[PDB]
Amino acid sequence: VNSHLSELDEDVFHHFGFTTKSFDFKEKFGDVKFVCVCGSSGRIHNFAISMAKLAGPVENIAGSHARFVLYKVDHILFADHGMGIPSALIMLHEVTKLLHYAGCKDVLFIRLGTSGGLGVKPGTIVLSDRCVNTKLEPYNELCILGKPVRRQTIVDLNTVNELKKLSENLSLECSVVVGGTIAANDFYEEQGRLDGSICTFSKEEKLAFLQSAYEHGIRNMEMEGTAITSHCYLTGHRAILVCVTAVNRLEGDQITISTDEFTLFAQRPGQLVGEYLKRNNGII
Amino acid sequence: IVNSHLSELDEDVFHHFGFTTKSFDFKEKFGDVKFVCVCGSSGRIHNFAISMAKLAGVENIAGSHARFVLYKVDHILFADHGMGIPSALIMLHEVTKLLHYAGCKDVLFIRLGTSGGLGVKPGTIVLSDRCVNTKLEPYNELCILGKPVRRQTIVDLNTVNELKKLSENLLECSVVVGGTIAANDFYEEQGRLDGSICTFSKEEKLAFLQSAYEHGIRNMEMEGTAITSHCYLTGHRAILVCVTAVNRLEGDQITISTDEFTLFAQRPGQLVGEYLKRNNGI
Ligand SMILES: Cc1c[nH]c(=O)[nH]c1=O
Ligand SMILES: Cc1c[nH]c(=O)[nH]c1=O
């Protein structure tokens, strides 16, 4: 626990647009044991109402001019985190502080994102069994006061296993695969795309990178994994990634699937996790 | 200077903007663009476009379910970039590809963001004369194909000088020209003690922020090094015009009200808007 939080009479959650004085956190959020997050505010809101209908209109808890949205259904908190580790870390710091003030222990963070697939069919759900950087290292890197810091990523494998076994008892119109996940600090160059505004490498060099990743167990590629699975473990919580793929990066770079098909693909992680939450006291 | 792989594509999908090269006639529709104004909020960047439009003589060009928004007022483009370098780089890659397809050359990018101030009053407009990382290095760091890559940051100092002179002829707040730190986190990397995790003392914190100030740093945000390194590499120009919402030499919390934050956040727009008016922006 950060000692300095006690010094504050009031703690302002700038990006969520509320403070500790806005409501009683223990009474408001104390029952929360699941936190579901994704890059889109619209999609996470769409997953939220889905859970609410299963449980029994979901209203935004966050402020009007806030950067992020915040929803609650029974023991589940819903929030968006934008794109990239820095933005995710903003969400992570303020949500985990929220859990602290609320008296929430051993909460499971679940990221429901989209990703580029490696050697898998588009629309495939990938359960990360590890989150690594572009060098396939199981760490998130930070620079604190100008000093280099590394924090190892820890995926909740027991929950991953339960999710995999659940998918076998379900009839989802897609595959559920357990495999590693690369987090990158860019959508184009760092992910080895050839169709960025800048490209300093060849197709051959690209495939050598992606193929090597695939043969190392990597099945998808996104932009927040290493932050989430490092931060939560360090704050006494658990984290998993449940991401659908929108393209097979071993074949292409472009997102060629239609807007409708993408929406349907993006809704697939919610199908699995939503059933998981229903069966694991996420909702009543 | 030009990524050759682009020509190999029959159609280019701007995934995060929700359109393609077959959506419009890029040379015809955007060929005139000489300005691109960006910030982290879609709501704010739209309002600034609305303010520019009324000043000129706004509808979203981006897709309905797209990550970013896109507006165009005369020779100016408007788009959001979310928060942080990776999010900015997504905006930067797809916008600069748009410009490439449109035949736009030597475009000035203008980031109108918010920031934490150093040694300056809250509400101060800081004109970046340099953008550096947390180690005060004028570079953006990337890991491309698992390999370390460094790209130097270059601010359009000529435009910066002109902006300062313009502000002197307009401005209740101060307009300061100083260095700007880009950080990959709002809390720990920015030396805040009020994050969920804190591994340093205030003595080490003060030493860090004070040693930044005396090095000419006046504010701190999260996208600078990305923008001022990417645009130069793509043959374009970039500046940062960011308001401060707190004096980090005094505290970490954003204690000002939402209304006051909104007023502060609209201040860069006020200065930039006039500049654009007097430099054939509208
Ligand atoms: C489809 C996709 C989503 N997010 C990523 O980071 N990469 C991708 O390829
Ligand atoms: C107010 C503020 C905005 N953006 C930042 O990156 N830091 C800050 O302190």
From Swiss-Prot, chain B:
Q: Tell me the SUPFAM superfamilies matching this sequence.
A: Purine and uridine phosphorylases (SSF53167)
- Gene Ontology terms: biological process: nucleotide catabolic process; UMP salvage; uridine catabolic process
Residue spans making up a coiled coil are: none
Answer whether the UniProt record assigns the keyword Transcription to this protein. no
Annotated binding of uridine, by residue: S115, G116, Q190, G191, R192
* Annotated GO MF terms: identical protein binding; uridine phosphorylase activity
Pathway(s) annotated for this protein in UniProt:
Pyrimidine metabolism; UMP biosynthesis via salvage pathway; uracil from uridine (phosphorylase route): step 1/1
One GO cellular component this record assigns the protein to is: cytosol
List its EC numbers. Answer: 2.4.2.3
The positions annotated for binding phosphate are G40, R67, R111, L112, G113, T114
- Any Pfam family the entry gives: PNP_UDP_1
Q: Does the keyword DNA damage apply?
A: no
Q: What class of enzyme is it?
A: transferase
Q: What Gene3D superfamilies does the record point to?
A: Nucleoside phosphorylase domain (3.40.50.1580)
Q: Which UniProt keywords apply?
A: Glycosyltransferase, Transferase
Record-annotated membrane-spanning stretches: none
What catalytic activity is recorded? uridine + phosphate = alpha-D-ribose 1-phosphate + uracil
Subunit (UniProt): Homodimer.
Q: Which family does it belong to?
A: Belongs to the PNP/UDP phosphorylase family.
What is this protein's function per UniProt? Catalyzes the reversible phosphorylytic cleavage of uridine and deoxyuridine to uracil and ribose- or deoxyribose-1-phosphate. The produced molecules are then utilized as carbon and energy sources or in the rescue of pyrimidine bases for nucleotide synthesis.
- PANTHER family given for it? FI09636P-RELATED, URIDINE PHOSPHORYLASE
UniProt-recorded name of the protein? Uridine phosphorylase A
To which species is this protein native? Answer: Schistosoma mansoni (Blood fluke)
